[PDB]
Amino acid sequence: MHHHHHHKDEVALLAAVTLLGVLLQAYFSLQVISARRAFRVSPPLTTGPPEFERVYRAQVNCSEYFPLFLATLWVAGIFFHEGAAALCGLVYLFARLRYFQGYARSAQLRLAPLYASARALFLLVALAALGLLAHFLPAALRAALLGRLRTLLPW
Amino acid sequence: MHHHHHHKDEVALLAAVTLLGVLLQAYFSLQVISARRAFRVSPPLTTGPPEFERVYRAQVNCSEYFPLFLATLWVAGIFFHEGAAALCGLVYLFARLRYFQGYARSAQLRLAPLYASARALFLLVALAALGLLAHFLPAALRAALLGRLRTLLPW
Amino acid sequence: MHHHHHHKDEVALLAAVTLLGVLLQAYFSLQVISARRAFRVSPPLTTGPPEFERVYRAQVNCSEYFPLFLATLWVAGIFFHEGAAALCGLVYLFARLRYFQGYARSAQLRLAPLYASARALFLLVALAALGLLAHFLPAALRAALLGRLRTLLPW
Ligand SMILES: CCCCCCSC[C@H](NC(=O)CC[C@H]([NH3+])C(=O)O)C(=O)NCC(=O)O
Ligand SMILES: CCCCCCSC[C@H](NC(=O)CC[C@H]([NH3+])C(=O)O)C(=O)NCC(=O)O
Ligand SMILES: CCCCCCSC[C@H](NC(=O)CC[C@H]([NH3+])C(=O)O)C(=O)NCC(=O)O
Ligand SMILES: CCCCCC/C=C/CCCCCCCC(=O)O
Ligand SMILES: CCCCCC/C=C/CCCCCCCC(=O)O
Ligand SMILES: CCCCCC/C=C/CCCCCCCC(=O)O
Ligand code: NI
Ligand code: NI
Ligand code: NI
Ligand code: NI
Ligand code: NI
Ligand code: NI
Ligand code: NI
């Protein structure tokens, strides 16, 4: 409720990539509505020509991975480095744009941008994990050390 | 680990709408379990009478958009205005309640609450984007200006 | 942009459980790719032997609930108690590991870990709600009281 300082400046790159990510998903959503119109595939029903089913499955897959991306983007960028995480985030979303576009053309044209997208996601997870190790490990090691020394009143 | 100040008060409306959103999704989930019972549609399998397939597809669609909603709600409410974002959030979730209820009755009875829900989501994205522009633009413009003036030792 | 204090230490358990959650989902994703290979079920297409359809449906269900889990984990852990929320989070994810593994074997072998997972999710929602009540209620009650007393210049 104020507060005479804010933490916006530490997370704005993350928020910018996050917004970009949302805009990407809405774009994917518009394409599926477009494919539904082109091939007359009506709500409910998610089956039809393989083409339609590739665009629909493309959107579904991106949606499933979007929270995973968001989660690791925020943990990595808060526990490791904002800029690095934001950069991997960019690569991830661009790869995902390629994945969608390719899959719409062909199943096989989804594979390479999928591999790009997973490497970038893997990098975020690695950064996040390292960032959390740096946070918990020193206190843990010290507590272990502060337990075995005792010894005590000897040694 | 304390810290003698917290930022809860800046985000509590956002957290309240977020919790409301979760409760809505669980409600949707309970209805699908109810529709599965009524029409004997057993796990796995997501096909059956169109009615069941409308309630099931209703839940699926809300689930796909829920992270997008959450993301933009938090960016908008942190970079633009908490109260405004929380309000749009309310409208979004109410529209989504209508969408679900309507779609359960009819495909065509999902359309108007869908249009309401997308306008509200659009407003959050707009707020988020404006909020981020306000944050990055001034520093960017100044840096551009601080580059071309030089001139320098003339002018 | 610094800032000579950080709030990492208040949320690191939450971030740790969140990362664990992401790793779990990626694990689920790898199993579905494995089941696709075993039973030759090719992208797009999400139908096949019931076995494959149980592993696929297992992943889908976890994905749908993962943002709900994340949302309530963060609200609960910020508005109620970090450690408690992180603990419920652990139980939730372990239950979810069991759910996946069971469902892969049998539909009926998914039920008990599902009940565990929903109780844990229910606990997080309860904590979150209590935490938010504690935050809004006192200010609300006082404002109500500060309205009816007036009376004023009497009583
Ligand atoms: C760094 C961690 C990486 C995370 C796991 C990598 S596995 C790839 C991932 N596999 C899945 O999502 C499995 C389920 C998917 N929903 C499906 O039906 O095939 C995928 O892209 N599936 C769809 C596709 O292959 O296009
Ligand atoms: C402000 C940004 C708005 C975001 C994009 C708007 S498009 C509407 C949106 N379209 C989709 O989600 C496409 C995929 C959807 N899963 C489907 O199978 O039809 C929708 O509501 N689909 C289901 C439906 O029409 O009921
Ligand atoms: C504390 C709040 C709890 C939230 C609601 C509990 S209902 C259980 C939940 N039901 C659903 O998700 C409904 C939709 C689901 N996608 C489906 O097709 O069956 C579930 O686990 N469905 C799949 C399954 O039964 O395995
Ligand atoms: C995972 C999806 C998006 C996550 C966004 C949540 C990040 C919030 C952290 C920073 C905000 C701290 C308090 C608010 C400060 C302010 O109002 O300026
Ligand atoms: C996107 C889904 C929900 C996002 C929630 C994340 C928001 C967290 C920002 C504020 C918390 C700052 C540190 C904790 C302060 C405290 O413990 O009181
Ligand atoms: C819901 C998915 C994950 C949510 C993660 C968002 C939580 C952020 C809150 C704490 C961060 C506050 C500002 C950053 C401080 C820092 O850089 O050390
Ligand atoms: Ni003040
Ligand atoms: Ni202050
Ligand atoms: Ni102190
Ligand atoms: Ni302090
Ligand atoms: Ni300084
Ligand atoms: Ni400071
Ligand atoms: Ni602070």
Numbering used by the authors:
A (entry chain A), B (entry chain A), C (entry chain A): -5 to 149
Sentences from the paper on this structure:
Leukotriene (LT) C4 synthase (LTC4S) catalyzes the conjugation of the fatty acid LTA4 with the tripeptide GSH to produce LTC4, the parent compound of the cysteinyl leukotrienes, important mediators of asthma. LTC4S is a trimeric integral membrane protein and a member of the MAPEG (membrane-associated proteins in eicosanoid and glutathione metabolism) family, which also includes three microsomal GSH S-transferases, 5-lipoxygenase activating protein, and microsomal prostaglandin E synthase 1 (9, 10). The crystal structure of human LTC4S has been solved and identified a unique horseshoe-shaped conformation of GSH bound at the active site by residues from two neighboring monomers. It was postulated that the lipid substrate LTA4 binds in a hydrophobic crevice between two monomers and that Trp-116 could act as a “molecular ruler” for binding of LTA4 with its ω-end buried under the aromatic side chain.
We exchanged Trp-116 in LTC4S for an Ala or Phe residue and analyzed the effects on catalysis and kinetic parameters. To further probe the role of Trp-116 for the positioning of LTA4 at the active site, we solved the structures of W116A and W116F LTC4S in complex with analog I, at 2.7 and 2.4 Å resolution, respectively. Of special note, in the structure of the mutant W116F, the phenyl ring has adopted a tilted conformation due to rotation at the α-β and β-γ carbon bonds. This rotamer opens the protein cavity toward the lipid bilayer. In the W116F mutant, the phenylalanine is now pointing outwards to the solution/lipid bilayer and no longer functions as a “lid” for the hydrophobic pocket as seen with the Trp-116 in the WT structure. Considering the inherent variability that comes with enzyme assays with highly unstable lipid substrates, no major kinetic alterations were observed, thus demonstrating that Trp-116 is not essential for catalysis. The 3-fold increased LTA4 turnover of the W116F mutant may reflect a Phe configuration, which leaves the active site open to the lipid bilayer, thus facilitating product release (see below). To detail binding interactions and analog positions, we used the structures of LTC4S and the mutant W116F in complex with analog I because they have the best interpretable electron densities. The sulfur in analog I in the W116A and W116F mutants shows a larger shift of ∼7.1 Å. In the W116A and W116F mutants, the three terminal carbons shift by ∼3.5 Å upwards toward the position of the Trp-116. This is most likely due to the larger space available in the absence of the tryptophan residue.
